[PDB]
Amino acid sequence: DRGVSTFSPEGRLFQVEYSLEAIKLGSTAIGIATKEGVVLGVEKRATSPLLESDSIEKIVEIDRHIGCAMSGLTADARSMIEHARTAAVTHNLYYDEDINVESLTQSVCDLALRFGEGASGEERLMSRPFGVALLIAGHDADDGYQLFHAEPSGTFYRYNAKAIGSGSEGAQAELLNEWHSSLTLKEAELLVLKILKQVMEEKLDENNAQLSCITKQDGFKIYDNEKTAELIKELKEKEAAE
Amino acid sequence: TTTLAFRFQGGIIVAVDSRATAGNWVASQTVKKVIEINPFLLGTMAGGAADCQFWETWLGSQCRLHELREKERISVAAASKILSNLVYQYKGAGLSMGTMICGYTRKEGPTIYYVDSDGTRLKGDIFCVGSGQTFAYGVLDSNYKWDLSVEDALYLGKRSILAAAHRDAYSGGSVNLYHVTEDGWIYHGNHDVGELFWKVKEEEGSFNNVIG
Amino acid sequence: GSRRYDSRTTIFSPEGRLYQVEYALESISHAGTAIGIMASDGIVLAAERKVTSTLLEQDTSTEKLYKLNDKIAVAVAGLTADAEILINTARIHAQNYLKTYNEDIPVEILVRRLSDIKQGYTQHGGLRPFGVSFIYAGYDDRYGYQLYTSNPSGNYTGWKAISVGANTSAAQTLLQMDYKDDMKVDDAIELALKTLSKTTDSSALTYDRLEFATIRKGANDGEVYQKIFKPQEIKDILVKTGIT
Amino acid sequence: SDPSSINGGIVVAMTGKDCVAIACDLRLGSQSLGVSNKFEKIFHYGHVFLGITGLATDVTTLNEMFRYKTNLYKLKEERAIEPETFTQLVSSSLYERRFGPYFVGPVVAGINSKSGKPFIAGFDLIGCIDEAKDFIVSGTASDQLFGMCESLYEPNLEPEDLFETISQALLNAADRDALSGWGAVVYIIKKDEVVKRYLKMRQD
Amino acid sequence: QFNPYGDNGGTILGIAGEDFAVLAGDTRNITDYSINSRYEPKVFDCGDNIVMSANGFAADGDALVKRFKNSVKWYHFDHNDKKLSINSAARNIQHLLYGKRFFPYYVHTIIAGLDEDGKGAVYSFDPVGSYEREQCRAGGAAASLIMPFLDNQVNFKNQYEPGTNGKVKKPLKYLSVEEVIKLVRDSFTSATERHIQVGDGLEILIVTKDGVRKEFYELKRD
Amino acid sequence: MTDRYSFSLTTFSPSGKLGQIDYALTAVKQGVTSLGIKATNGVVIATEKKSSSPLAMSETLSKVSLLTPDIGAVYSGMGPDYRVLVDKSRKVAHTSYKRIYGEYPPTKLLVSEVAKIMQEATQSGGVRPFGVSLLIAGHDEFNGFSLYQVDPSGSYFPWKATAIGKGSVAAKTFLEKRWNDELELEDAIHIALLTLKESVEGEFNGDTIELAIIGDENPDLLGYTGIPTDKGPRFRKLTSQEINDRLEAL
Amino acid sequence: FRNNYDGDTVTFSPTGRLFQVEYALEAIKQGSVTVGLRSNTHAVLVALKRNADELSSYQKKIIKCDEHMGLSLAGLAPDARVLSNYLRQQCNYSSLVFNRKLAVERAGHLLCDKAQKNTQSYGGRPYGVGLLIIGYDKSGAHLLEFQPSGNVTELYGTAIGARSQGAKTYLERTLDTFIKIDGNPDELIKAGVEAISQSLRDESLTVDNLSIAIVGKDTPFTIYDGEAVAKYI
Amino acid sequence: MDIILGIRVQDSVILASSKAVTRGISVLKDSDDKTRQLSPHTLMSFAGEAGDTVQFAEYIQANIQLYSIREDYELSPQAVSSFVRQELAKSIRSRRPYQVNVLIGGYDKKKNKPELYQIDYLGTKVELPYGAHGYSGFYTFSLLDHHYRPDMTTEEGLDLLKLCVQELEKRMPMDFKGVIVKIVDKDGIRQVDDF
């Protein structure tokens, strides 16, 4: 039986390659980055009517200036998000300044490869890599708003807008046409809610969809359900204006 | 070094002096002895300056880590007992700790905890730490009321440091005031103790030993 | 490397079962039969040996009855080799509790402790599970007499009368028709022998192939005396109750 | 100063014609203050009796440690511990705590049921086995007991008369010492029964 | 019986201007009553418009500076050459000083540069760990000779405007970089006469927004 | 360099029975015959020498060994596996019982320490079971003489007389009929030889039949006089001359 | 199509080869092209970066190791992120202890022996990255090629990655012109851009797709990017 | 130093403690409470070295509470005191020795008995009809020897404890500032506000 380190005849680690398909099975995360802020949109995807849909969490604060979205097997991300708060917090303790986004992302990517069978004293703290991919959003004074996609591949790209999850293929087709550098914060919110509706498998309502932004002034804020209801009513209007 | 904190109707007044010495030589006369742990907790530095400087910036880390995991502000009760467990592990290795962790949540009311390197964690209503602590106590016990105006309580705090800074050697320098309300601490400015003395002597008539 | 030769004794099956723990249950169904009955005023432990030749000296032999302190005896069914290992870890944990609280160990603690040892090997380690099943008869003031069986899963539950070993099913159905709650220690003895007499592979039932030990409160001052019978008390009690 | 004299106590033990006696005081002091008069010093495993003197907390630590060995010894072998193997055992427990030992003076007394011989032995600190057949003493007032026994004792006393001899040895030594006093227990171990007597003495 | 702390005298001085800061220190390196070296710098450019001096025990001092320059390199390699600012470095050197606390460093440290706004900033450390931002701080052996003279010529302490009779404190100014150099040079000429461990030469490192300039002066050889 | 076998090589075959303890019990049935008989005043154990060649000396080989001065052992199965198990038998007897209680372990006691060594040769990882069965004859003060068999599984049993090895099926049938309750150590010696004469086809010299008693104590082998408390060793392996006496007594 | 000796690194094949080390060498032939060449006074790295798609940015390819040594990867990013971190530390371990700029040649061997000890032992993915390590010490300019087998060699010029062969051909002709260009850093960068244009499969050079780095007798290791490489296309 | 006083009567253990806590020159608090409720029927007063007391009293308490959830049962006071005596024995051999003294007052429900155990810092427990620690012990024992009857009702016992404190106030050279008095009977633990 294969080990966990084995390469294929192509030169790809089996587990790391297989892991990418676990992300395809996850729920939809959309991220649009503008010059005024980044908007994070998620399909909560309740599984019953008895399931209370408010306790489900897919957006989490890392620090007042970094927020995170998850797609895939999301209990693995419990371990990744804990590392991140420590790196971000420990780094504000040693140098009296908030991490960059670009540096924080890279620390979680180093962590990702750690699978193995053990040798000497060296920690290998998984048997298979983190079965989850993350959209790290955030803002520093140096490079404005940024948006990153950190995959268990161990590589991260900075994106203008990426969408991962079940509807990744059809979602990113719509972004490629709709995005340009001149979106504001209130147009991106309606643009995420329009794309979230095309790839969604339910009815769009306030209970099973969540929005989040990141501005310098106010930090990282998750919208309550009340505010999201107004933006859902405001989508139906612009499509009947036409 | 003379620092005091005392509960009252409107929250907590924290007043600290400023002078930091090494024997006869006065090292420096501007020492922010009050450490901003976070926007709702104040910690005072008394005794061994290093220990309290370092281990209460570390304490601000554990407050902001516990605020992200649970998503709620941290009790004053919990913040102090994170710190007594830290210095208890080190005990006898020779560190010196003497702090008041002061905060004001809705469920506890305004609270003070006084953490010591012995391992002591005391809840209290009036505290006073440092060499001049006995002088500050005298003025504070006679004029203290649970019901007191916010004007009169700022002015009572300022006078407790002045009474200590005059008699005791090491304290001196400058007074800082802080008013811990529900929204967090507001810094009430720095007062030089040399210019303050003639002001108090004038208004009240206090101080007659000194011809000045 | 090592992976080729690896049995993997801890994986799940395609249906959410543990093969290797199932099989431990199978090897316990070949070993000798053991029965325990709970009366109002004592407990009978009675076990049938797997050996029976006459060269063997079954008279001083004890491979079924063990005392864990002076209030808890167990019976064994499975690998007798394996069982001596868990009994010394129990003997030691029973005593640690007497050291630290100056009070005889509750039956509930000593049973729950052994179970988790067994659980331990199927959770991690890659070691083969234990091949043993215990009946614990013990006395404590909290519930009086208590009876507990544990198997190589680690799941234990109390009982009024239970049996592990060969034909567990057949022995349970004979007991079920006869057992009553008003039984005394005399009545229980007579039901225990008779039930082993109906299941034994050989038609003859002899005093030498039976092991037998009770726990009675007829020891003075509100106490309990465990006796593992001598071969001469068993012989007389087999003629008394009319099995031969 | 010495750990022994912080709490005090004294044990003595004799032999006679087919029996042993063993006695102690019940006082438990914290230097000048006397705290309690019910603190037993003699504990017994089966038919072996063990007196411990010295620092009161080591007494209680060694009393749960030997109850742990003789219980586990009794289950595995299926006979009670015998006095000869118990002496070896007391000595080996003390010795592995070689450095900074228990500050104690154990006395083993018990009739061997095998041979019928009465048997005593004493120890001290690290683990030196004092073998005698006359009498054995421990504790603060060990000098004073030695004086009493040596003039009083004589080989082979019947059980009723050995009770008179060891009472005077304990009772006159104790009254001439500061750190021993209140109450006294004499156990007459015969070969079948054990008689336990509390003695009336001076409560100053 | 090894006594692991030595002494090497020497004194250092830091003055915070409005757009410049100086850290100066004497170059004489002693042990007891022998002069070991005329010329031995203690003020180092660490890159990023930080200057740092640890004065006191020269062996623990040189080591603390080697490890700090090692922390500036590793700052660049991780956060993509974001320049460590004087504010940042301060909380960092606090972590190296405190990392030993049961065989501590036995040095008195001063760093100086421009902070975010662009005004001179000096930080002063204790050996045990804590640190405070000052306007002016001396250190080393003759620190108690130069401090009081500086409190009188910068902060105008205990000076009152003439003809007000102590009822109006003297008005304060800002200092020019040319003026501060003359203050430091006067201090250290005074220092030499009365204290036996200052001399041979004074070296001033001036930190402006354009870089770091060195200037070297002769003092008395005796 | 590393050991990365931590997993059991003994698993449960799907119909119970641990596969490796079954096999090892077959290598115990290939070994050379060995048997033991208990009397009321001793125990005898006897075995046959097997010779690699006529060149090989056989006196140098010990096939009966001493564990303590009162407990002797003899095996059937594999030679290499018994050598290492007799040395681990003496250490664990001295270290968890001689030093701690003084006297030498009782015979019940000692069998249990040896059975834990066997047992942990399947529970543990990386190993396979010892390919031997032991007979352990000995004498303790409070139960007299006794005789034990410790199998590669770990189970032990008291016997009155038993045999193991290739002639085990034939031997135990004969001992079933011949044994009695009244027996001398001298009479038993005559039964032990008579049986083991049927099982050995090779040369039956008294050089090549090693017999040893756990009889009674020898004042002569003690090595020192003047302590009436101490007693000699109860074990005594007989020389070749003495065994040639009992052969001509057939 | 998957062999029988593809399990751990311990296994040898009956041909004699080690298959798992050969599989890690395919991880280089799917990375993006990168070209290194040196004269006797300047080393130069010219790498063509790779975006993931349009909205995406570009993936870094050139790592500043120190101020006189830098390497460029082609293959798996996290494997290089361990090997570049290790050289950094070994360059500090020389400046601290011996106060010696770590000679380029010695840093190659140090890297090699770190790759070897993971193909000897059971478990341990072999490193699936090919580095080019340029640098300038006391013995002049140096350019190394490091295979994942571990074998390091000294060259006047090489390339690795997808369709590298078209560039490596241009370097075999012009080797005799660009080797003599000394004391002129501009022309040596020009010869390196032309090399990598031969390997393109019509991706087209761009100001955001190209990355150059030089190091010399007088310059520190510096990376040009974005607007800074507009002059050199 | 401190004063901790324990008197056992017909059906109650009464424990008293000192309200004061003095660290150095100053008295810092006059309402502090030096006693933790281990269980619904077990109270434990403690006193001794600075800072160490508080850590060692919360420790014991967590282990006793854990046992109560784990078996769903209340440990008798006999069993609780042997556990506390075990933990002090460990520490005195270990690197850092505790100096704590404790009185454990409890009402065993199995026996319908009050019981009082005194454990000093060496690790020596003894069951008593009344105990104390420190220099405060010296002054009390000689009143109790004289007035105490074993058949006293709860209300007389409190009248005997008013007398013990009045003798302390007159002779000790350290202020302690009255006492908190607590009763443990079969109904639970109630604090009588009067001294």
Add this chain to the structure above:
Amino acid sequence: GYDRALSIFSPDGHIFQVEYALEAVKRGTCAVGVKGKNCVVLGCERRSTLKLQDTRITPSKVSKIDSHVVLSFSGLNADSRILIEKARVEAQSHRLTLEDPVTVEYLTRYVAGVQQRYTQSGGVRPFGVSTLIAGFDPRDDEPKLYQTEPSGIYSSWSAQTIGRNSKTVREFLEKNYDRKEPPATVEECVKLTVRSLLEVVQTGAKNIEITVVKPDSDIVALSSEEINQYVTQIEQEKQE
């Protein structure tokens, strides 16, 4: 050490040791949770096939973690005790260092985090247990009811069921539980949870256990008589 990578991805993108773990929870006895206006009610299936088994001393399916947090479970009985030991531990640890009892959501996050850990540690097989953690936060009367599973993900529910025949019970709870209006009182809620169970237990008054947990640390177990009464009423009510 023993550190084989027992749990690995398959090419379909599911871990096969985790799917196998969740099938094991299906064969388990059935446990139901429903939260009323201001109570929770945990109903559990007792295997009553067994006869001559004493109920006085036999471990129940509801094990109190603290004095206001209860936990129920489906799956392997043996492995379940391992979670409950680490949970009782975690509840006293959190009381020690921060003060204040654990809030139900935190006690779940710990327990759910243990089941997640054992899906990465090499050498360990996943847990075969899914729990319902229920109770009241301290100084509050909002009922809370959570479910963990051997994937490690946890969610709050208004009603839920785990174990065998769960689809049939869940269907009944989607019709008979109005999300807006809970069972009016504590007595109506018990009558909703019993009536759900009697579909898949096919009656037996002894088979059903009901534990009710109320605000302010009031845990009570309904006795056999009470259960019988309720069953007879519902049977008679429904019968009528």
